[PDB]
């Protein structure tokens, strides 16, 4: 975004250690649990009645992997998140009707998951850089809303 080369390196390097599969399933599940109203878009997923039911739902897990996948690919275009997510921005608006506020919530959940995972390694300065990223991605995804 407006990431410092140093801030760019910190992001880049932590990410290389990330199991997208697991982090993605966990970020999305935590979202559905912490902010239950987000479940409004996943009725067709099934049983989201309990934390256990959400965290275990394979439809949730697989959606999480798809979302983090796309997120992952965006870290390669940190200089043009806007052009990288344009089509995804239109889809979310025009087809999915997802309020962009949701992008923000996930971002924050994502940050909690990384801290959870990396403990020590997820230092204040590393968090600062990730916060800039999540904000940047949320902004890019909301960009084509009208």
């Amino acid at each position: 975004v407006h990431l410092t080369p140093e801030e760019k390196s910190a992001v880049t390097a932590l990410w290389g250690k990330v199991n997208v599969d697991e982090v993605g399933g966990e970020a999305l599940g935590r979202l559905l649990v912490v902010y239950p109203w987000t479940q409004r878009f996943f009725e067709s997923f099934g049983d989201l009645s309990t934390p256990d039911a959400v965290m275990g739902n394979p439809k949730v897990k697989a959606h999480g992997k798809k979302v983090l996948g796309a997120f992952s690919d965006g870290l390669a275009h940190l200089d043009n998140l806007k052009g990288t997510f344009a089509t995804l921005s239109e889809l979310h608006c025009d087809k999915l009707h997802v309020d962009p506020e949701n992008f923000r919530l996930l971002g924050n959940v994502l940050v909690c998951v990384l801290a959870h995972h990396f403990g020590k390694e997820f230092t204040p300065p590393v968090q600062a850089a990730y916060q800039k990223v999540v904000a940047g991605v949320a902004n890019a995804l909301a960009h084509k809303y009208h």
Binding site: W37, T38, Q39, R40, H97, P100
Partner: protein, 141 residues
Amino acid sequence: VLSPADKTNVKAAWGKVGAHAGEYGAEALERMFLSFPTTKTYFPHFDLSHGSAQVKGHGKKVADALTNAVAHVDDMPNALSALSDLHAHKLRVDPVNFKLLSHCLLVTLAAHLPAEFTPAVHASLDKFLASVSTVLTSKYR
């Protein structure tokens, strides 16, 4: 919390709204749709065209609910329970959107009640809409 003063202010300004509540409700929606387009994501099933009967119909419903909250200013949590349930469990509107509608409701009132929209009334009305918003979002989690 609403003070006695706030309560008088709200009953007074809402009193003036009278029979225009419906139209004002519809207008607040339109302003919200134009200024905060993201709010449109909750009405994919609506004709959001200028002078849409759906918007008109919806504006009345919202206005009727506010009128009901004014009528029960000392028991809002109970007067609005049903609506609190609906929003929490079915509609699941993200909390931030309440602040957007509130703001557009304030704009509409300002635009229509020049004489009554004093600093003091403005303050009371803001606190009021914040309280209604708090009630409607109280059962979210």
